[PDB]
Amino acid sequence: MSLNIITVTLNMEKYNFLGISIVGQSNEGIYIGSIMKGGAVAADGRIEPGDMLLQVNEINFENMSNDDAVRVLREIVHKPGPITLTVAKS
Ligand SMILES: O=C(O)c1cc(Br)ccc1NS(=O)(=O)c1ccc2ccccc2c1
Numbered sequence: 001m002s003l004n005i006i007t008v009t010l011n012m013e014k015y016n017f018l019g020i021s022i023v024g025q026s027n028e029g030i031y032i033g034s035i036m037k038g039g040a041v042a043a044d045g046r047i048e049p050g051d052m053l054l055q056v057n058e059i060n061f062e063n064m065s066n067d068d069a070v071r072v073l074r075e076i077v078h079k080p081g082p083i084t085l086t087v088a089k090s
């Protein structure tokens, strides 16, 4: 079996939102659920639904409830500067 890791840096200059929902928990992993067409993640085009979310900026997502993962993504999107996502491809 093959594992494909990609790291995606979004400058968030032309987009306010990532435009993602997330599914699953890692305090029992967390995956990209929906991607909305108008957001930074869709514009970049590399991340797809079912990709596993490993890290966003300095936060690891591998010991979190779904609710806490949504909370930390809210905090990151409301902070200035680029957003770096590391995912494992489905
Ligand atoms: O993120 C943006 O800059 C954006 C701008 C426009 Br115009 C439209 C959508 C955008 N982002 S999006 O991730 O697709 C998005 C974000 C929140 C939404 C809330 C309600 C309905 C659609 C939404 C789309």
Ligand SMILES: O=C(O)c1cc(Br)ccc1NS(=O)(=O)c1ccc2ccccc2c1
Pocket (backbone or CB within 6 Å): 016, 017, 018, 019, 020, 021, 022, 039, 069, 070, 071, 073, 074, 075, 077, 078
């Ligand atoms: O920007 C995002 O796509 C986003 C995704 C998650 Br999961 C959590 C927070 C996110 N950013 S956010 O600016 O706080 C936000 C808040 C409310 C939203 C409501 C509908 C659609 C997108 C939203 C994004």
